[PDB]
Symmetry: D3
Amino acid sequence: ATPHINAEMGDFADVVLMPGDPLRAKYIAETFLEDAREVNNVRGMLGFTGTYKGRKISVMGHGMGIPSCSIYTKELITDFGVKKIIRVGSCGAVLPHVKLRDVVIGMGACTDSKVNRIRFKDHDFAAIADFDMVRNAVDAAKALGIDARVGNLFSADLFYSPDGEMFDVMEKYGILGVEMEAAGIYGVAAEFGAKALTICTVSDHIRTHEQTQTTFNDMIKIALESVLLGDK
Amino acid sequence: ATPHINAEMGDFADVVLMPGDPLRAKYIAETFLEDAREVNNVRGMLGFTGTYKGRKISVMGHGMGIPSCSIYTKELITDFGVKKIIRVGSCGAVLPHVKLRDVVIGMGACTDSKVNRIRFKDHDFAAIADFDMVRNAVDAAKALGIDARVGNLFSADLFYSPDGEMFDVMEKYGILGVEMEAAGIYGVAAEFGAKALTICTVSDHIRTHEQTTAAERQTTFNDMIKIALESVLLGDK
Amino acid sequence: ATPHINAEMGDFADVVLMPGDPLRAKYIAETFLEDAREVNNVRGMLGFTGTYKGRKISVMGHGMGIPSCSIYTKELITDFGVKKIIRVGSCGAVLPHVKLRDVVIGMGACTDSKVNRIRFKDHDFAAIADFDMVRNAVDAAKALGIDARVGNLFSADLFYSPDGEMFDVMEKYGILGVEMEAAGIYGVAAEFGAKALTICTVSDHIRTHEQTTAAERQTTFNDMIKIALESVLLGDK
Amino acid sequence: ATPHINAEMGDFADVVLMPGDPLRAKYIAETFLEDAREVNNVRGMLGFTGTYKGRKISVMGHGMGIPSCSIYTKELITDFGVKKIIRVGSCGAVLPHVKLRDVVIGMGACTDSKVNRIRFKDHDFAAIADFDMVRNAVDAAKALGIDARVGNLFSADLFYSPDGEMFDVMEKYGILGVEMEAAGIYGVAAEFGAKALTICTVSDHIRTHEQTQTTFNDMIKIALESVLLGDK
Amino acid sequence: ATPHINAEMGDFADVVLMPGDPLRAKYIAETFLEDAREVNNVRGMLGFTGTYKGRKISVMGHGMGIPSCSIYTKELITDFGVKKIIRVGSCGAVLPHVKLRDVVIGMGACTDSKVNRIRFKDHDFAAIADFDMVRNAVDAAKALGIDARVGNLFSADLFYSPDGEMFDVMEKYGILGVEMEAAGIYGVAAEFGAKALTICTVSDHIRTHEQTTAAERQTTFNDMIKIALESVLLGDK
Amino acid sequence: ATPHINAEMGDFADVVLMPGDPLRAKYIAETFLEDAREVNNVRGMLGFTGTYKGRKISVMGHGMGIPSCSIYTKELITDFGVKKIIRVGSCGAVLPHVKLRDVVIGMGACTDSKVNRIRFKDHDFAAIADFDMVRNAVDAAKALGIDARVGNLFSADLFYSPDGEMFDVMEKYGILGVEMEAAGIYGVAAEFGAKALTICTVSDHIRTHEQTTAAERQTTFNDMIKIALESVLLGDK
Ligand SMILES: Nc1nc(F)nc2c1ncn2[C@H]1C[C@H](O)[C@@H](CO)O1
Ligand SMILES: Nc1nc(F)nc2c1ncn2[C@H]1C[C@H](O)[C@@H](CO)O1
Ligand SMILES: Nc1nc(F)nc2c1ncn2[C@H]1C[C@H](O)[C@@H](CO)O1
Ligand SMILES: Nc1nc(F)nc2c1ncn2[C@H]1C[C@H](O)[C@@H](CO)O1
Ligand SMILES: Nc1nc(F)nc2c1ncn2[C@H]1C[C@H](O)[C@@H](CO)O1
Ligand SMILES: Nc1nc(F)nc2c1ncn2[C@H]1C[C@H](O)[C@@H](CO)O1
């Protein structure tokens, strides 16, 4: 048991999918996993372990924001033997040609946070994902027949930003989605030695303002299927 | 109803108490509020509204970290007409004479986050509480025979710090407690024109550990809540 | 004797009043203190020590700007055993509802200076006053039938700033007054473990100014000192 | 003709390989290209255009450092219709298990420069390469039977750094190679809309101090071969 | 009349000498200038105007620290038509080969202040003196048989810095002396299109200090003024 | 022999002139130096050594940008015993009265690069030239009947700026010319204890273009070199 997770070494698989919402994790366990059982409930952060096509898999929420997800991804890596972490969240689009329900794969993640500058002597650390994992996900999407854009994400500290002009800069630099965790997960994976990847479903559009724990299944199917490709 | 709070105008009181753990909100509602009702459950962040000695009061969790609590407090203030927000949590101690189960009141809050510099043109914005609320809390604590320290808190962005260098620095400058929300909540209150206050009970001490008892810790957590609810009543007068 | 203060331990009281204008020290000594005696004159910064209603008190100017008052407040604290510093000055307002001659008490102080970042490993240090001292001032004021505003102050490094947009930002975040010292003094207090407070009267309203008679100005200045002095006795209780 | 390049639209191919040394470009033109001809010589920055297996290809040096290579990559993209840029340079290793002659592919690039902060409102821009290009290079290396590590590079402003302790941070975060251009090329590709990739040969070791315009052929072969995979 | 200088266009010469110690102005006026008359006394900052070998010249203190001298140098330049500012003060040395009482001329000034970054969109602005003024000073000194060191100065915001390692760094990069104004004055000069220069005598040697008689000190101070004054006449050619 | 310069101790003179273009080094060697010989060719950055009026002098290119010229100057100073480095290049003008073919001398150099902050603990290091060298250049220019401005240069990291905002700022603060090396060369000289100087001829004007003639431009470039070589001779005396 750790400060934020009440479980023992072995309760989690070496691979864990992590949505920001605890209720979506529960839903993923009920819909995609077999013989699924609850392994954690402290502070309401539901965690589950089960099987997908004979493969042991875990799924647990991580809360909103870098500070919250940094705590959980670190504890799993250092005390529960987790090797791979795949974040399956939602994001906001800034580009004109990006529409709701689109699937994005974050090869990299920009941020307005200071966490990585605190780790890198105040210089620029390129927060990137594991190449193999990115590739496994791309191959899984193709096999499933689902479209998916690979590119940069932007991890925001303020969902309600006081500076809207920064969206112009994001668009100019081809940012595919705005969320609040990627850059933090990638910094942790590198500090504590593990591999990570973030997959997101465009759930709203920052320019047009159109919006949408259920129904984001293609994202899940790609993630689970990409894990098996990695096992081979 | 916003993307994070599925409720309507009137479902929340103009005063909201906010713990970090959503399960703690249910504990508070069940223990101190009368005629309580659930007003939100999105993402599992339970909210409740009831009354305390005839006063309408609400209690809802905010999650861990400045990014999380900044979303909730912001929506409460701009979409549900909330005027006061009081955070009630825990923190770690760095000062030798600050002991476990001590009640700390955050008049100010330092931080390693960059959100207030983004707001303040890259300068130093002193994140502070509302004077009157601090005052009402100090007076409420006294009426209950409880001791309370008033000073600076530190809102950390990384629970697990890469370099344990800041602990010596915080101690050298008198920081009373280390948590993860105060600075962000004070920034939101200033930006949208509302009032806020943070109260914490020392749950752990970085500078040499040495715990106490379960019944004693739980007595102190209840006193903190008692101080919060009673401070509100004094303010109504 | 220190580099900027030629005196010995015991010449200053444990409480010192400090105006920005050096010429204000002699005025205060002969107008409010009893049995005053001179204790400093290095570089022409005259210091005095006497009593107010039996209480031992000292007064001496600090000069304009953070760098200057940092030198004086620090030498007093580490070499003359001073426990409390109270700055008494003027400020400019940016809020429409804040009028000329208003008395403001700075619970916190924002700044564009780098002194605190140099102290706090380039992070955000909330420079705040001592809570009790703030409360003592508020109560002393009420007793004199004067209503004081408590809030954030902004300590500027450039009286003539190249960019004027920062004023809109200060107004948006509730800054009560603009001056040039508070954040420096609060930083020093936290560094050497002492207590500080800044009280100011609005002497000008940046953007849309008014007009004041010399008689009005001395009346307000005297009220501020009276407030500062009575707050010390309240604190002694 | 541009301020730093004396040529006309059409003199360069839509793809250009760029080593830092002008003499290595000349060597690459003589050794790998057919019917190669000089297209530029201003300030000594030799540029050449020719063919590789019937495919029109260009090769031109860019000088040392981000400021120098920023000028050249920008002019090629805006006035000569260049679509892809592949940097083929050398680097210094910091990790124990990395040895001379090893080939590295930069999926990302960290830096202590301020150029990207000047473009991104002083926030953290993740300087990454084009996914397809990275993948084409990985596939080419496998087909050639050459080993190649994919990861983060570090673009230094000071070859002779006053802070050696920063090498500890680099090593801790898995930096595969230290050079002086990647982060700059990736920022330019994004600003002016083109694709880029950096390939480097470990030419020295920062810890052991062992050192090495010729002989770095595997790097070249992978780059040229990866371009053809991209054409399909 | 300006906020800090109660005078009118024409009361100050187009060249002003400014010491850090306000008490130095009256001394200089009666010891080096002819037919001196008082032109300022606001806040006790006394200013004088007279002639030196027929040339019109003024003297007035600026107070310790960048914020203070920025106010005075700027009002003189924009409201009284001053074209040249020469600071005459003291500094502390960090280099072994720089001895007590040495005269140093600051061609450039480093700093830990943020004033210039605020002016230069957070980039590096090289705060430098006017080349001719520097050369005039070097030649005036030689003619008086005094060899002056020309180089970099460092303007500190904190006389008592929390970190002492910065001194090793200053020594490594050749800093000749440590003071608290030059970078502020040079910034103002560049902002309002005027000329400036800082001349200083080593009054203390940080780390490994020596000892000086009061007689030695006045001799050196007088030499510096003599150097500053003769440099102005050379420049008039 | 280093990884960038394939030569031995004695192959370079203690004074090296450095243009940005390697082809320009050959032009200078062929035009002004007697008995010249090539001493380096690595990466194509040609170096030469010969004599001017019996004085041994070297000339080698440094490439574009601070990262490039920082490598070469550093190796020359620490591995080839070079004492003086004079950069001779071109720059763009921002000031209205600075006209094409004007000779600018960089007493100081501002920059948007971060290399000097990495060296100076994140503070402001004023990147300046060696006084005597500036002086020798001003005196050499005069003996040839040439006019020369002395002031600040700006070393840019991006030739093609993302935001043309800094041009107005540079102009407001009096920058004489825009190039890409000065600040980095001055930083290297300070770090390894050598002397440096940058001289430029205005090759273009951002503020409204309007060129001249080829024969006239080339006459001015030669005068600059003449000023450089002659300034060295004065220094030998
Ligand atoms: N427009 C948007 N902006 C940001 F910053 N995050 C967005 C988002 N749309 C979805 N998300 C994801 C990330 C957070 O966990 C959470 C915030 O509601 O859901
Ligand atoms: N030592 C400590 N450090 C930090 F950063 N936060 C502490 C804490 N002790 C308690 N807390 C409170 C604040 C967070 O919401 C939450 C983090 O577990 O509990
Ligand atoms: N508008 C204003 N702006 C600033 F920066 N300071 C102001 C002021 N009005 C009064 N003060 C106080 C503070 C300094 O000691 C001094 C500066 O003249 O008087
Ligand atoms: N150890 C090293 N450090 C840095 F910064 N760059 C290195 C290098 N080894 C090779 N390079 C590459 C990049 C430059 O273009 C050039 C510098 O000599 O060659
Ligand atoms: N060691 C020293 N450090 C600093 F920061 N300033 C020094 C000094 N010695 C003299 N001075 C000059 C500059 C200020 O006006 C004033 C500060 O006492 O005198
Ligand atoms: N307008 C201008 N801007 C910048 F940044 N540099 C300029 C220039 N005009 C000439 N130069 C000099 C300096 C570089 O070495 C080189 C860049 O082409 O020539």
